[PDB]
Amino acid sequence: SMKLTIERAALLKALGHVQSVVERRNTIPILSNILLSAEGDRLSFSATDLDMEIIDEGFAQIDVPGQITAPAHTLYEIVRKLPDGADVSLSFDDPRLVIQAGRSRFNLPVLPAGDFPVMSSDGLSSRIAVDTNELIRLIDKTRFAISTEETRYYLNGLYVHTVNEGGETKLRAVATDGHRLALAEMPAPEGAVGIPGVIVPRKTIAEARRLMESAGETVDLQVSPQKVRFEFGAAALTSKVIDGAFPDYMRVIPRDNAKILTLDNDLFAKAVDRVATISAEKSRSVKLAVEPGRITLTVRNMEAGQAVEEVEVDYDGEPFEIGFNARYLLDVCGQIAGPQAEFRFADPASPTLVVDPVDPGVKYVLMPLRV
Amino acid sequence: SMKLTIERAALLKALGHVQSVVERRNTIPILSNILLSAEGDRLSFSATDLDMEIIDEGFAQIDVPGQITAPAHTLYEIVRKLPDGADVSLSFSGDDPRLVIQAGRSRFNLPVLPAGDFPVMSSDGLSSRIAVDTNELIRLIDKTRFAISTEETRYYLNGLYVHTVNEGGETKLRAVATDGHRLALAEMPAPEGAVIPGVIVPRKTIAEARRLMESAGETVDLQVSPQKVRFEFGAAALTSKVIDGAFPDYMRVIPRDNAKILTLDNDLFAKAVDRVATISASRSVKLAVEPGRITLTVRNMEAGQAVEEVEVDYDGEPFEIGFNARYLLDVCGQIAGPQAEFRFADPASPTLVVDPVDPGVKYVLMPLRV
């Protein structure tokens, strides 16, 4: 038996945190459930998709301790729709979970707690406190470049690791999908120096980042070669990592591109977006005809449509033509923090570096395509 | 057209009005296009899906008059992204076979199709213009829209029946929607000129008319024939076929003599219905009605149950009746004041819902087995 009462707001806060992990499509019914575990003065909540597990805790008045599983999204929506201030009773005498508040009564089917997946966290490092805003930045500056593919390939997560440069150790995140790269870094907090490099799955980053919005001043990170764990206070997210070595991305990031050009980032981005409008295609390529003082942008669609726009830029080198996917270019322009962007080109077939003058702790790479 | 300049704001306004009718996909390429016709001091814009046509016009400096067609959504999107205040040149000549759109440092070339292959929407036999208050016309639509069937056939249920009735010596302009499972009626006093054959206005036409009412003025002009309806919103106009067919004698489905009368707090009732309906994913709800109370029950196939008691104003015989939960919530969503009044006969008979604060609306709900 389990039997308790909990304030709607506390119940809603916890269910809200954990239910995000549950895939709407699930042909294994137990993976649609939350594990509820009541003991002492706390109701604990766990949900999983097998690759990761979110846990949270709320205060509750516990008459009889116990554990049961119940449908996650349905439980969340019931509680959401209960009146403000409602005190919520959870109990069992059918074999269903009884949720009772004011004049509403719900009976949900349950599944036994013993069939609920167990996520082991053996051999994690000690907790590493990382400033929340700094961590949010590592993710927001890079996340867009992680592939959206449905595999467990190394490109489908964010490579988190430390490196030694500029007379200190940095905590770095690198994302690449084979078409583009993003890199962001920060001075390594105490305890992060020399963590093993881990590839954190895309969905895990998305969930961590969501939980970061409601976190405090810091989030604790723990890492092992098999597992990564984020603690946000009462909530925690534990995840598998992608197995295998991440590519030697330091060879992909060009160091010696000598054709340097600076431009007004907002004007350029608007010009790119404008010329790209000619095409409705999923991928749209834009030609950059670069010459002293100017970039001429051209997009063509699959039905003889054409758009051209000239943008003045700061450049004095040899003229050349280079092509990029317009979405990848706009993604980079979207991350630039100030009004200028700096591009470093070599030849039309080589990777292009984009640097942000107001932030030396990011690097973006664009891969050219045929123009 | 052949050669003109037009302010971005004037171009965008007109393109935004007309492009909504164009389907995202068209097997006939010219149906994706806007007809541009330049003459005098006006650029005219036309777009169509063959069932209806939207037209509009804007001021322009016309150097060379003429007519051409070009991709609607693309032209709209290009203009949307041009900088504020941009003067926009449109030209078509023997140089390039494409429409040339030029503003500032931007130049676009769009493929065209000839104006002579663009569909023609005839407007022969329309009544003279009837001026209808915009908010009132909006109300007629918003009070009833939800009950139109969402099916793509040319059956009377897939449109809004707009007609004029002599109701006890007073002429009303009335709108009726039903999908065979529920009905909605709204009416207003008939404007001068309305007492017009009854027409079934297609669902999409109502949607487009309603969108255009968002940026209309004080009145909108209505014209009707047995084949066509036309809405005029100043420089913009929407002309549409009607659904050919006899709208049901809906008076036969609206119950007049339902004697079990109950009134409740609409807002609290709707919240209770929404709560119990949560446990499921066309969900029925059971209403166990007795003096002073409705007990709401929803069950699902997965063993899930939700029950809630709501206090109501009723002292008649007890009974149980079932409704589709969404249909019931749709009605409660239209009720204008704090109460709703239900009138029931027996559990297998249609139920009337009236708003005690607006006698110009009627709703009917068909029961389901409980």
From Swiss-Prot, chain A:
It comes from the Bacteria. Its main location: cytoplasm. The keyword Phosphoprotein does not apply. One of its GO terms (cellular component) is DNA polymerase III complex. Keywords: Cytoplasm, DNA replication, DNA-binding, DNA-directed DNA polymerase, Nucleotidyltransferase, Transferase. PANTHER family: BETA SLIDING CLAMP (PTHR30478:SF0), DNA POLYMERASE III SUBUNIT BETA (PTHR30478). GO terms for biological process: DNA strand elongation involved in DNA replication. Belongs to the beta sliding clamp family. Pfam families: DNA_pol3_beta, DNA_pol3_beta_2, DNA_pol3_beta_3. The keyword Nucleotidyltransferase applies. Confers DNA tethering and processivity to DNA polymerases and other proteins. Acts as a clamp, forming a ring around DNA (a reaction catalyzed by the clamp-loading complex) which diffuses in an ATP-independent manner freely and bidirectionally along dsDNA. Initially characterized for its ability to contact the catalytic subunit of DNA polymerase III (Pol III), a complex, multichain enzyme responsible for most of the replicative synthesis in bacteria; Pol III exhibits 3'-5' exonuclease proofreading activity. It is found in: Cytoplasm. Transmembrane segments: none annotated. GO terms for molecular function: 3'-5' exonuclease activity; DNA binding; DNA-directed DNA polymerase activity. Forms a ring-shaped head-to-tail homodimer around DNA which binds and tethers DNA polymerases and other proteins to the DNA. The DNA replisome complex has a single clamp-loading complex (3 tau and 1 each of delta, delta', psi and chi subunits) which binds 3 Pol III cores (1 core on the leading strand and 2 on the lagging strand) each with a beta sliding clamp dimer. Additional proteins in the replisome are other copies of gamma, psi and chi, Ssb, DNA helicase and RNA primase. This is Beta sliding clamp. Gene3D superfamilies: DNA Polymerase III, subunit A, domain 2 (3.10.150.10). CDD domains: beta_clamp.
From Swiss-Prot, chain B:
One of its GO terms (biological process) is DNA strand elongation involved in DNA replication. Its main location: cytoplasm. SUPFAM superfamilies: DNA clamp. InterPro entries: DNA_clamp_sf, DNA_polIII_beta, DNA_polIII_beta_C, DNA_polIII_beta_cen, DNA_polIII_beta_N. It comes from the Bacteria. Keywords: Cytoplasm, DNA replication, DNA-binding, DNA-directed DNA polymerase, Nucleotidyltransferase, Transferase. The keyword DNA-binding applies. GO terms for cellular component: cytoplasm; DNA polymerase III complex. It is found in: Cytoplasm. GO terms for molecular function: 3'-5' exonuclease activity; DNA binding; DNA-directed DNA polymerase activity. NCBIfam families: dnan. Belongs to the beta sliding clamp family. Forms a ring-shaped head-to-tail homodimer around DNA which binds and tethers DNA polymerases and other proteins to the DNA. The DNA replisome complex has a single clamp-loading complex (3 tau and 1 each of delta, delta', psi and chi subunits) which binds 3 Pol III cores (1 core on the leading strand and 2 on the lagging strand) each with a beta sliding clamp dimer. Additional proteins in the replisome are other copies of gamma, psi and chi, Ssb, DNA helicase and RNA primase. Confers DNA tethering and processivity to DNA polymerases and other proteins. Acts as a clamp, forming a ring around DNA (a reaction catalyzed by the clamp-loading complex) which diffuses in an ATP-independent manner freely and bidirectionally along dsDNA. Initially characterized for its ability to contact the catalytic subunit of DNA polymerase III (Pol III), a complex, multichain enzyme responsible for most of the replicative synthesis in bacteria; Pol III exhibits 3'-5' exonuclease proofreading activity. This is Beta sliding clamp. It comes from Caulobacter vibrioides (strain ATCC 19089 / CIP 103742 / CB 15).
